């Protein structure tokens, strides 16, 4: 039997797909450009990419189960840009935390000095530092290659989570000490929901997916759940970015 | 509104030389400038272009490769470098300026003039009747010639005159081909279809002896005609 | 395709250019409307700080450029040409405490101001001038004369309290607007400072605003 | 009182006017609208080739 | 005295009101129920103007429709080349509020006002390449709601302090004033002919001046609110006029009386603008909600919707050719419509 997992995601990756590729048009076309609408649309289009790669990723499980999948290079294609799509997303829900940070702590600086190019550069470098990481994650998966592996993805975790809880406790007490509306705790509660969803969907695929290079076992019933929670996440975060 | 030019002299062959232009009296920034050349007897040469915000540096063939054109703003200057002079560059050069945008009148003003001397697929316009005998009071009619049709798709026809008196700089008369232009008299006409044009000037007087030249603005290489002359 | 319409594309291009960097400049630069009573303190606001139509005046402090409109001079139906303001960053507002004729006059533009359909969130400033002459004056005559349902102590802090609480309480919706307060004195200029904090806050609010926090 | 004179010598003026009846102006309105009928590219399309937009 | 004074008024309006109603044979519906309907017009966007940073407040058509100038609230006034959507010139204001703009018939010159009680004229052909100031009107004293040139050295104005001017444009004097009205003036058209011209003044009504004898004419009394737009009918016999009260009507010059009116149950918001076609069949009104309509000036049945807008359009017009109309909005673009 396939596991109801593939089922549920393969029903909640055509939606977020869709939503996805609206928010796209949208901040492409009909709004115009400020500097958090360049890092809402490269977060929506590397979660299209990834969710696009998932819901392919499943068929073929669904294939090789069921039907077949004597493909070679389409499918290696495909989990490359999968594992690409997913560092992307990471990094840039971290930028952007740091850069409602910034705005709220210095605003003066924010709406008098920065530079109008300084969101694509960030970006642009993110996207560098992503492709990096995945090719070298690629070239190695024997001892040596897991320690690669497990020394980048650590650094990676241990630099960018810390820096987006930081930013995100700084931003919610500095609202609080001086908001003097009343209804503001609605942000309140936005921010914290924010925080839920990056921790909840940060750990698992990444710390997993580094103690499968390491093990290729345990995962008794986890895996699965893991790759629904971190998809669940690119469908969400349109609505948390830009709607709320 | 003048340009005054300077910098011309007499050079040895193989040398270099640098002539300079200098505006004054209206926004040089928003004019493109050109640079046109006479010889000694001959016609006028279209030579280098330069469009405002120094982003298209249009050259000529005869020239291309050892010229260089250049503008300041700020300083409201033109500049011409010359290297590896030869013969055939012995003549006079002009300073122009031209504004293009939908209505306007390019080749409008030019320059005085500077003489230089070294010691010792494109479009042809015909200008056949070199010579006019006419008196006073007389209608004349002038002629013209081009090898294609300069009728472009947009309604435009870009042919244009220009009347060079004697010991003077040339002035513009008529603006693609029907439109007349700013402070001349009103008996100056002209008129005629794709790949052959016609001058005309009615009740002749004075000060209006001289050469008169055609010229063409549908393409790169600009390319002047022999010109026709008037004689009393 | 283009014979010297190339020319014109390039000219067109370079307008866009200096366009679009004149923009840049004039969004960096915030907007306060200036109104009060005739006759009241509202050059003299101006006047404290270092500073027919639209009166437009400019000043800076602290790297940011300030814009003051008074448009008190205009003498015609505000219905018809308030909806210029929408986008202004504050409605800097000033009553005078002497005269004491001037006042029911000044609650009601007050109350008109706050609850105009334009400025539903903009953050009003509100300045009291003329404090001694005022001080005086109670002293001199009781306040009780405009003020019949009056019943408080003939006191300066209680007159001041009262009178402030009597223009606070015309504002309906409390939930959106952020209406200040501030006793301006004839000496030690303090306005511009009481002015750049209004709009420190209004420049965060905006952030938010951008980022999509709310 | 001042602009009560000038106000009533004003009424007064217009008072005094001839006035056609209103089956002659609706006449002359629909004469001139659909006289003028096929003048209206907006009232009725033009072929692509004419057209300049 | 006083109240006599009054007492004649009010009876010589109801004299007035007792002659325009014998006049009243028939209504315009009636006439027209027999002619055809328009039935259903979609026009289509085909260009869209961008650069404008604000709000843009008014336009006007080029006498050759080809050229047109608009006004924003950024301290911008842009001359666009319609068919290739190219800029000409981009002429920076004194003032940033600018309430009105026109086209001088010649293409020589283009004025604008605003809130600084002042209308300046700006030359387009000067022989130094760049636009001038060429003259300051400086006698009002108030808000400038409209301007249109009769020639290219007079001008008529329209303000907020209730009174109408006739400038001449050399010597920079008030020819002529205008006065009569109560309430402020908003909106001002000139007849075909131009000896003649209207204005609805916020009092609920719109007057007719005489150009070179300087006294109102005619006076007409039918709307509830304040007049925003007017525009006179091609042939010069009739007008059209915009209320805040939602609903349009039209009058003509010689019956003296309201001819029809135009409104509909789901529209609560006023018109901003009006403009005829070149026939005169076509109402097309620029409305607060976002969207303008399409009117049937005979049958009094709307015939059309534009909704390319998403903020309030403010300036609406129809080129003398009749080939396309252009309309701007609070959103900083300008949509040609065909
Ligand atoms: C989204 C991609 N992953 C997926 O669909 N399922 S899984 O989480 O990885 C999963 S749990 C499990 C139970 C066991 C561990 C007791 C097995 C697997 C698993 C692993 C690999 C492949 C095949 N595969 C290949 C490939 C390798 C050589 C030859 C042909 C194909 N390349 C891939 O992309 C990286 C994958 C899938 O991960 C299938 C199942």
């Known amino acids: 039997q396939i596991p109801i997992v593939h089922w549920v995601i393969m029903s909640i990756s055509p939606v977020g797909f869709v939503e996805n590729g609206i928010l796209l048009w949208f901040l492409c076309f009909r709004m115009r450009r ?150 503001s705790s609605k942000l309140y509660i936005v921010i914290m929901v924010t925080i839920i969803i990056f921790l909840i969907f940060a750990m698992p695929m990444r710390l997993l997916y580094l103690l499968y290079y390491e093990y290729w076992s345990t995962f008794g019933n986890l895996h699965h759940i893991s790759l629904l929670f971190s998809t669940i996440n690119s469908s969400a975060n349109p609505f948390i970015y830009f709607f709320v | 509104v003048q340009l005054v030019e300077s910098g011309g002299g007499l050079v040895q062959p193989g040398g270099s030389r640098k002539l300079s232009c200098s505006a004054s009296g209206f926004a040089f920034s928003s004019f493109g400038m050109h640079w046109v050349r006479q010889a000694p007897e001959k016609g006028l040469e279209w030579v280098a272009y330069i469009s405002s915000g120094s982003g298209t540096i249009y050259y000529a063939d005869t020239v291309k490769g050892r010229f260089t054109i250049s503008r300041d703003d700020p300083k409201n200057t033109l500049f011409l470098q010359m290297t590896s002079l030869r013969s055939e560059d012995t003549a006079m050069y002009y300073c122009v300026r031209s504004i293009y945008y939908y209505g306007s009148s390019p080749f409008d003003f030019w320059g005085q003039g500077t003489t230089l001397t070294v010691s010792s697929s494109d479009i042809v316009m015909t200008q056949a009747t070199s010579s006019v005998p006419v008196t006073p009071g007389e209608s004349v009619s002038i002629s013209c010639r081009s090898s294609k049709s300069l009728l472009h798709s947009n309604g435009n026809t870009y042919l244009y005159w220009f009347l060079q008196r004697p010991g003077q700089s040339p002035q513009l008369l008529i603006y693609r081909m029907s439109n007349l232009a700013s402070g001349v008299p009103d008996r100056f006409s002209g008129s005629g279809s794709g790949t052959a044009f016609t001058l005309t000037i009615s009740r002749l007087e004075a000060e209006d002896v001289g050469v008169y030249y055609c010229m063409q603005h549908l393409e790169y290489p600009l390319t002047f005609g022999a010109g026709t002359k008037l004689e009393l | 395709l283009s014979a010297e319409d190339k020319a014109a594309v390039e000219r067109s291009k370079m307008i866009d250019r200096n366009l679009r960097e004149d923009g840049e400049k004039a969004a960096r630069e915030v907007k306060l409307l200036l109104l009060g ?42 219905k018809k040409w308030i909806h210029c303001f929408e986008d202004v960053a504050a409605i800097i507002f000033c009553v005078d405490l002497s005269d004491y004729n001037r006042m029911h006059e000044s609650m009601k533009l007050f109350d008109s101001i706050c609850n105009n359909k334009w400025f539903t969130d903009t953050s009003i400033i509100l300045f009291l001038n003329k404090k001694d002459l005022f001080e005086e004056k109670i002293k001199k005559s009781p306040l009780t004369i405009c003020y019949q349902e009056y019943a408080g102590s003939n006191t300066y802090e209680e007159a001041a309290a009262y009178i402030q609480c009597q223009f606070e309480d015309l504002n309906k919706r409390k939930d959106t607007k952020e209406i200040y307060t501030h006793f301006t004195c004839a000496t030690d200029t303090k306005n511009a400072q009481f002015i750049f904090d209004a709009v420190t806050d209004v420049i965060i609010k905006n952030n938010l605003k951008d980022c999509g926090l709310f | 009182i001042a602009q009560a004179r000038k106000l009533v010598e004003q009424l007064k003026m217009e008072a005094n006017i001839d006035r056609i009846k209103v089956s002659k102006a609706a006449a002359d309105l629909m004469a001139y609208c659909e006289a003028h009928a096929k003048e209206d590219p907006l009232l009725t399309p033009v072929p692509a080739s004419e057209n300049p937009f | 005295e006083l109240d006599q004074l ?37 026009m289509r966007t085909r260009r869209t103007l961008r650069g404008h940073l604000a709000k843009i407040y008014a336009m006007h058509w080029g006498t050759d429709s080809r050229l047109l100038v608009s006004a924003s609230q950024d301290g911008k006034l842009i001359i666009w080349d319609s068919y290739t959507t190219n800029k000409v010139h981009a002429i920076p204001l004194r003032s940033s509020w ?81 006065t009569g009205h109560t309430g402020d003036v908003m909106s001002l058209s000139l007849a075909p002919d131009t000896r003649l011209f209207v204005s609805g003044a916020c009092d609920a009504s719109a007057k007719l001046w005489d150009v070179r004898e300087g006294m109102c004419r005619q006076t007409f009394t039918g709307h509830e609110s304040d007049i925003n737009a007017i525009c006179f009918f091609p042939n010069g016999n009739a007008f059209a006029t915009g209320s805040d009260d939602a609903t349009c009507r039209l009058f003509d010059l010689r019956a003296d009386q309201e001819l029809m009116t135009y409104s509909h149950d789901n529209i609560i918001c006023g018109i901003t603008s009006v403009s005829f076609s070149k026939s005169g069949r076509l109402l097309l009104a620029g409305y607060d909600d976002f969207n303008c309509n399409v009117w049937d000036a005979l049958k009094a049945d709307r015939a059309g919707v534009l909704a390319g807008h998403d903020n309030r359009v403010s300036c609406l017009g129809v080129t003398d050719d009749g080939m396309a109309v252009a309309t701007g909005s609070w959103d900083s673009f300008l949509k040609i419509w065909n």
């Not at chain 5, 700006?122 to 001038?132: D, F």
Request: charged share 15%; net charge neutral; hydrophobic share 40%.
């Open chain 1, 34 to 183: 400020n500097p958090f609408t360049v890092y809402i649309t490269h977060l929506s289009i590397a979660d299209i990419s990834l969710l696009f790669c998932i819901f392919i990723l499943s068929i073929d499980y669904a294939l090789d189960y069921e039907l077949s999948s004597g493909h070679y290079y389409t499918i290696v294609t495909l989990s490359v840009t999968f594992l690409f799509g997913y560092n992307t997303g990471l990094y840039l829900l971290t930028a952007i935390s740091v850069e409602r940070c910034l705005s709220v702590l210095y605003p003066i600086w924010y709406r008098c000095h920065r530079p109008k190019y300084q969101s694509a550069l960030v970006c642009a470098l993110l996207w560098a530092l992503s492709c990096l990481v995945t090719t070298m994650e690629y070239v190695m998966c024997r001892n040596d290659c897991r320690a690669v592996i497990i020394f980048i993805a650590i650094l990676s975790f241990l630099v960018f989570t810390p820096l987006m809880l930081v930013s995100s406790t700084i931003l919610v007490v500095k609202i609080r000490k001086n908001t003097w509306a009343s209804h």
């Open chain 3, 37 to 78: 009573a005739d006759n009241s303190g509202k050059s003299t606001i101006v006047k404290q700080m270092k500073i027919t139509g639209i009166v437009e005046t400019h000043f800076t402090f602290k790297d940011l450029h300030f814009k003051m409109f008074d448009v008190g001079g205009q003498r015609s139906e505000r």
């Open chain 5, 6 to 42: 009054r007492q004649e008024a009010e009876q010589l309006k109801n004299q007035i009101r007792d002659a325009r109603k014998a006049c009243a044979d028939a209504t315009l519906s009636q006439i027209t129920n027999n002619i055809d309907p328009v039935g259903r017009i979609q």
């Open chain 5, 98 to 178: 600018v309430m009105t703009c026109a086209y001088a018939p010649s293409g020589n010159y283009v004025a604008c006002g605003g809130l600084d009680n002042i209308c300046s004229i700006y030359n387009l052909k000067t022989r130094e390449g760049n636009v001038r100031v060429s003259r300051e009107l400086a006698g009002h004293t108030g808000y400038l709601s409209c301007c249109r040139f009769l020639d290219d050295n007079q001008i008529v104005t329209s303000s907020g302090d209730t009174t109408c001017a006739l400038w001449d444009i050399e010597t920079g004097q008030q020819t002529t004033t205008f």
